[PDB]
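Worked example (supplementary).
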Amino acid sequence: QSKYIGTGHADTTKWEWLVNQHRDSYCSYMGHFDLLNYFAIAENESKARVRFNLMEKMLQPCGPPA
Amino acid sequence: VPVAAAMCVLKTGFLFVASEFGNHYLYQIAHLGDDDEEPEFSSAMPLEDTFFFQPRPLKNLVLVDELDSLSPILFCQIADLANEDTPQLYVACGRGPRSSLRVLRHGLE
Amino acid sequence: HAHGMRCLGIPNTAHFANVTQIEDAVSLWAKLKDTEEEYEDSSGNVVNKKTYEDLKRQG
Amino acid sequence: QVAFPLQYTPRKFVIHPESNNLIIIETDHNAYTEATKAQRKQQMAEEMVEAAGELAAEMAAAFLNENLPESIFGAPKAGNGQWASVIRVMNPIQGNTLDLVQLEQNEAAFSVAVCRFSNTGEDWYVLVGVAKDLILNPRSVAGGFVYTYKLVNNGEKLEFLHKTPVEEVPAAIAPFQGRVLIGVGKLLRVYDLGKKKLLRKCENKHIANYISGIQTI
Amino acid sequence: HTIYINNMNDKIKKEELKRSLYALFSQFGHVVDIVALKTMKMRGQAFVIFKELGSSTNALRQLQGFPFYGKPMRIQYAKTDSDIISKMRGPDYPPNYILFLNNLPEETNEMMLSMLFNQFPGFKEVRLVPGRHDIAFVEFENDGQAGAARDALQGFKAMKITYAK
Amino acid sequence: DALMDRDLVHRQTASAVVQHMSLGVYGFGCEDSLNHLLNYVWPNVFETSPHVIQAVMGALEGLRVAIGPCRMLQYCLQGLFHPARKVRDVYWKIYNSIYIGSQDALIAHYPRIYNDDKNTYIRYELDYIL
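After joint prediction of all chains, the assembly is encoded as:
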């Protein structure tokens, strides 16, 4: 369980849980060709630049911790 | 060329282009495109400035084929606006400047 | 308890089934507790229903 | 198929029954409408000569004279808050564009509806819901607007009627019982036609998050 | 709630002035307090404060130009709220000088509302005349006078007059 | 009748029944009644008896695959942050069981959670509208 990333426990903080679901959402975006293409349509960029901005947002999201 | 999500290169002067969106394209190489006035940049050329250059049509290539691409399909309406009884598919589809409105009928070309 | 609430003016419902002090539930109860009828000059799109009815009686 | 070229990326289109034409809404993010590329065009044109070099040599006239096919070189487009929104009256039978409506800089139009108010007559209407100043990823706006068009020449011509402001972006527009439903943001509202601007004949503030789309039996 | 009086005979001693002022104005409602000084600046003047606002309006209309110790007094609504009122009690245009509303019919009319509005030097706009005779639009040069007229008939048994807030 | 408890073994064994039923029926469209039974399953979550707790675990796992995660998670939300230690221990155990499998499909079902000062908790990607 521990070595499986995303494992929660009783002491789990807000920040960690939400940054988890963030990163997992981003791996889903990298995963599904379409939804990615939807993103590229809406905000106009390349598929590439989209995935790049996401890979930048992987570590950050929500910004600094508390 | 229009933005290609993936590129396969074939022997005997061929270039395949599958665009990220809009029609696919098959290109053929009629010239290696060297040796002329076209500036050929180096990594050691002096500056600290970025070397510029002029866009233009294809002078290194010829366009063999254009493959039908519906994606992305933004909006779809099936309605019969013509004389016959078979409904035509009016589809607003495309990406950026290349976006277009296409009509689908039931036929081979 | 409900007599103190309701007679106090704080209506009796679960919402308030926590806090004891008289004060805080007063602000809580304060937390508990507009159409356009188009005049003919095309400016009355800001004008209220009842107001335009008053201008019906005036017109 | 048959392919009819366009400029910006259409978000939707609607049937006009009697004129039997097609109204297309186009929008592009990071995009510059024609006149915008004209003001940046002339902008760089001016900023060229100011290098004060021998003045004599002008690439400006040829560069501006150069107009590239917008499909082959793609988007001459960048910038965050900028947008492009165009409307089109196009024939279904052939590919000719009957009319072209070229709107403001930042205003993106996410909805359009064509109907006839029960109070007025057979006069057609083109209602284009429009957003103002999208800041896309935080979420905010400067506000919203709605444009109205009478759809004339039996529906073969458009004319701007009025610009009616609204606090929020309309995400959809649908006709209901001879009048026009508009949800805006999370607020659902029943609108009726004013001859200067629209007025609200009802509202509901309950819906928590946001209004995506609306259908009406 | 407070009325400003000027044009008073300044020869009366201060305590006598205040006591006659209290007596005279008691006929309209309870007077909470009276501020009157004999400094150069303030001589010949007084602020009379009433518990009820209707009392202030009635006083203003009924005693305008009343001979007091030999001179005709001039009354007006005060510019600001009295300190005592603010303490006893505890938007940007308010107080406004344009009161539009209706609920004042009954053969009422424009020369009627024009003379009632006329009472006030602020008499500027008066709109009461259609078959209605019940929609009153009153533009009073300034809110002291609009407030004076409004405070004078502030409960025309109930009419509705709504400042152009 | 059985899951409503006369004595623990009823809840246990009946729960096992819910499990094997839940794996067996998968994908055929009967989920409704399985939701109803999940109601009565749900209170048994709390106990220290090893066989009934592991039984209930198997139960809610089969119910996970049959019903789909969305409904599960909608029962498992509030228990995560509840003040008590017990409730958090358990609902986090459950939420982990729901989390490991079908982690790919959970994305849609995380609710909207407002953003605080130092952190932005809204994922705006889903709000991009054409």
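Two points are worth noting when inspecting this output. Chain E touches chain C through five residues (CB under 8 Å). Helices of chain E lie at 14-26, 53-62, 83-89, 110-118, 143-152.
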